[PDB]
Design an enzyme around this catalytic site. Structure first.
Site, PDB file in Angstrom:
ATOM      1  N   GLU A  70       0.814  -1.213   0.000  1.00  8.21           N
ATOM      2  CA  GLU A  70       0.000   0.000   0.000  1.00  8.21           C
ATOM      3  C   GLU A  70       0.856   1.275   0.000  1.00  8.21           C
ATOM      4  OE1 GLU A  70       0.172  -2.171   2.517  1.00  8.21           O
ATOM      5  OE2 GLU A  70       1.621  -0.997   3.685  1.00  8.21           O
ATOM      6  N   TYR A 188       8.897   5.085  12.095  1.00  7.06           N
ATOM      7  CA  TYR A 188       7.526   4.867  11.642  1.00  7.06           C
ATOM      8  C   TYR A 188       6.550   5.686  12.473  1.00  7.06           C
ATOM      9  CZ  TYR A 188       7.587   1.218   8.043  1.00  7.06           C
ATOM     10  OH  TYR A 188       7.713   0.518   6.859  1.00  7.06           O
TER      11      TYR A 188
END
Ligand code: K
Ligand code: K
Ligand code: NA
Lengths: 579, 577
Positions: A70, A188
């Protein structure tokens, strides 16, 4: 080279840099970073198509090798490139446009993220359920990266943290194992902070129309063919040799082997070499409905090249860390399962509350079976995922985060199973009655192919300074490393295509002296609105006063909110729903 | 309509919105807002060109003058990347601008002078001292809390003597009686440029004057896509209905060519109104003639008053065009140097040749001990393509119009162009004996202009004084320009604001499915807040910055707690530690 943000630098076209007509490109690897490098060379560097040689390693539903990940709105570099690339499905538009419109028309979301008990949605699905563990996350962010060098996630976080829904979401969706890089985890957390509102339901995710090869590679390839780039097939590169002159470093020579014959190339500075070093797809093996796939730690071209290079100068990194000593526990296996009929459609459909056959988004990303011993997750993309599929076919992706565990129904490891067995464990977990499982899983009804991958978790291996080589090593002259094992000087995140595009950009702009800003990593972590918003959503939408934190901290917060009454800060807090 | 940021929404092309062929566009005003509205209609709404009608007020040089820009004019850059350059064939206007800015970067070697040609010793210093806190107090103060409030009502008298106020007021045309809220907006909006205000390194400029560089490529693009320009149009009113809570535009009553005219309109005819003007009623003078003082309200203002009459939400022009103080900025002049006789004075100021085609003053130079608050600038030359090779064009402005000059014992509004030039030459250190000849026509030609409303954008205001770009319930009527209320915190007296109103109006009315960029979010970026506290204090570490005692206590306590954290790293990066 410089970094930038905003529309001014984005829409701006760079001037043709000095003396690029005397220069050529050798792109070793047809991986995303390499091709991206080539595209930037054609568009921004204005190097000529007939002077770009991409040295490939290969001669020219159920295709794992073609499968892809994605993206999100804030892949800045990737969207720059793809706005330059012509689409194939909607002629006259850019790929970015096709993607953008598809995302508007068929927006991604998940109606079922976590299941258990053979097919029940987890009662607390949609909740992070962090409690005070949220504070731990904050602490991680408050901790400078140099201070956590080589450190692991497991080494930082409490056991209680690892029991949270947050960890289930995070680990499964990002493929973070407990022994992985804490520094990368932190990256992240900072990088995708703007999407903390959309991780549990995956509203943050965006997807291509098709598998990675049809949607992401073919339009690039067509673009390059249109611009007369040179494609070399069945080529197998073996090494690159470098000299030290004072503090300068120069690539003098490349050694290799192609087709059926050995070859060599001495290098002009005007010949530019980019190495898509490392691979996570190499050594992939196949099985089928009635056959499994074999365990390995075999190395290959990328890894060897990278060891030679480390041998030549320290600045080329310490590679073994990525391809050596991966745990048996590691994610290794990913499988594809093609449904030949509508017999198993109701189980999935009952999960998603949507029809499998309207061409629209289904699971909207992975569904994780939380009480599965394999930590089995699966996803069903918008269909068809491959254009080959017949109108009744559906393609399902299956992965196991744990490869050292005996399954709940099939008491074998995922690695020891045929496609039928993985299908079987999944069916058990979907609530298929065990008496029906054998007939429902078999080829007449379901066709399942597994793949084993030694290196799928390699990017996230913990690291130390100098372990990853700078995209332009201090003193380098015509040599750059690109891809998810290269060290961008930014805080950007690997296991993303955005990182590949960024490395290609930074490399091309630096080496070929392209006078235009490279977008900085999107600055959501420095946007106070995003910090506030994240505190709101991370806490499962609790006002700041109601959030779980130590008593002196709670008091301090009460005092702070007292002080800033009727102030711009109060307005910011109100906007974030923290008061 | 929605707001966005980042490259994804920037590079994305919108879908053709539904039913854009049963709709039409009437743009009242051919100024930047109007032209921009037309550009967005053509490019994004994909309205057919011959269905766009721009009603211009004019038949088929200060008035040509325009302002500088900066990198974060997000909307404006979104527009100009679509517009072909005329100077650089095959490229976009943005490309021309970008390359020019790269080869000839703007900066100032001399911002403040005094004592007739001496550089102010403290040039480059904000010199705020503790007054810096006031600025912070303003940022920390919600806008609603300073509604209608004035700048001098907030700030200490010491603040007004700071170099910061001199820079701020002269570069932005802020008078003391102006909107405190607008000042606050300027502070937040341009916070990312606090490192570049004194030396004007934050500024970027077109190759030429605004009409030549900004307007002409637009005109070429628009005509190229077959938009229809209707000339000598004088709109007098637009008639609107109230149905339930809805508002609809019925008719435009105009006079064109001396004849009353009308256009009744369907719900599907879309009209964009550039309400108000800061250039209207401008009068002219020359070398031997002052410009006539005026209080006249022209077409634009009358139209806005009538509109205010029709609906309560349509704004209040009177707060902007009435009772402006005599002190206000009114006069701007152009002074064309016919030769190199006075060139050494400017060249000694700029440390650059006036004749290399590159940047000169790099923005205004302010003469601090001038009674007029006289500022002047020399753009990169030529500023007008008309100029012959020996010519240099100088822009002169006075922030104060109720004061007697130092050499010319008149107010600027009572001066000939020659007198304004004489006062300037005096302040440059030209010997008093030489001044009359040097100012005279053989050597300089100076044309003054008196603009009644040049300071109108900044007049203090209250909620509803400016009409929303699309007022609630409007279905076919929108207000655009620096007198319209964008729902964002953007700053007026900027071309970027005009472009923003056009984009917001077209996207809202014609349902264009693409993000409008939010105002660039530097005020919410901690790196920028820190950087700002660093540069504003003239590069002092946070502990050393001048502060009230309890506030200082809070700071030492805070810095103590966050010791050895990522926040400490950020403070390090900002050079605050
Ligand atoms: K932004
Ligand atoms: K110059
Ligand atoms: Na396509």
């Amino acid at each position: 080279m410089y970094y930038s943000n905003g529309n001014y630098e984005a829409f701006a076209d760079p001037k043709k840099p000095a003396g690029v007509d005397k220069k050529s490109a050798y792109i070793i690897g047809s991986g995303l970073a390499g091709l991206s490098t080539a595209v930037f060379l054609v568009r921004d560097a204005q190097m000529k198509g007939e002077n770009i040689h991409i040295l490939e390693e290969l001669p020219v539903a159920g295709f794992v090798v073609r499968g892809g990940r994605e993206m999100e709105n804030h892949f800045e570099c990737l969207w720059d490139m793809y706005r330059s690339i012509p689409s194939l499905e909607v002629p006259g538009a850019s790929y970015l446009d096709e993607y953008y419109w598809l995302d508007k028309e068929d927006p991604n979301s998940s109606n079922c993220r976590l299941i258990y008990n053979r097919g029940d949605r987890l009662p607390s699905d949609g909740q992070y359920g962090l409690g005070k563990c949220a504070n731990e996350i904050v602490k991680l962010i408050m901790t400078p990266e140099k201070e956590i060098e080589g450190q692991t996630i497991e080494e930082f976080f409490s056991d209680e943290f690892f029991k949270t829904n947050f960890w289930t979401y995070w680990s499964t969706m990002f493929a973070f194992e407990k022994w992985h890089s804490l520094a990368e985890m932190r990256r992240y957390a900072m990088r995708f902070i703007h999407h903390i509102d959309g991780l549990p339901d995956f509203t943050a995710l965006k997807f291509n129309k098709y598998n990675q090869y049809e949607s992401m590679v073919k339009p690039l390839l067509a673009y390059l063919k249109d611009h007369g780039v040179q494609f070399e097939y069945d080529c197998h590169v073996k090494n690159v040799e470098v000299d030290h002159e004072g503090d300068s470093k120069i690539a003098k020579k490349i050694v290799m082997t192609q087709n059926g014959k050995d070859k060599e190339i001495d290098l002009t500075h005007n010949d530019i070499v980019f190495v898509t070093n490392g691979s996570i797809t190499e050594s992939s093996t196949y099985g089928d409905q009635n056959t499994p796939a074999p365990i390995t730690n075999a190395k290959g071209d990328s890894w060897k090249l990278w060891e030679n290079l480390a041998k030549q100068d320290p600045a080329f990194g310490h590679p073994d860390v990525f391809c050596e000593n991966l745990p048996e526990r590691s994610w290794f296996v990913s499988a594809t399962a093609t449904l030949e009929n509508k017999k198993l459609a109701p189980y999935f459909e009952r999960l998603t509350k949507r029809s499998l056959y309207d061409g629209k988004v289904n699971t909207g990303g992975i569904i994780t079976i939380v009480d599965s011993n394999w930590e089995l997750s699966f996803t069903i993309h918008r269909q068809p995922h491959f254009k080959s599929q017949n109108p009744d076919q559906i393609v399902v992706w299956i992965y196991a985060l744990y490869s050292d565990t005996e399954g709940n129904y099939i008491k074998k490891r995922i690695v020891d199973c045929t496609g039928k067995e993985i299908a079987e464990e999944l069916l058990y977990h979907l609530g298929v009655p065990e008496s029906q499982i054998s007939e429902l899983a078999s080829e007449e009804n379901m066709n399942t192919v597994p793949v084993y991958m030694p290196y799928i978790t390699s990017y996230f291996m913990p690291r130390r300074d100098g372990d990853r080589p700078d995209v332009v090593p201090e003193g380098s002259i015509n040599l750059a490393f690109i891809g998810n094992f290269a060290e961008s000087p930014t805080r950007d995140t690997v296991f993303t295509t955005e990182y590949s595009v960024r490395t290609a950009m930074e490399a091309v702009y630096t080496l070929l002296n392209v006078d235009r800003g490279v977008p900085e990593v999107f600055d959501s972590i420095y946007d106070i609105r995003q910090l506030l918003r994240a505190m709101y959503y991370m806490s499962d939408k609790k006002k700041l006063a109601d959030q779980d934190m130590p008593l002196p901290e709670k008091l301090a917060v009460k005092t702070g909110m007292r002080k800033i009454k009727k102030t711009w800060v109060e307005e910011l807090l109100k906007e974030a729903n923290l008061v």
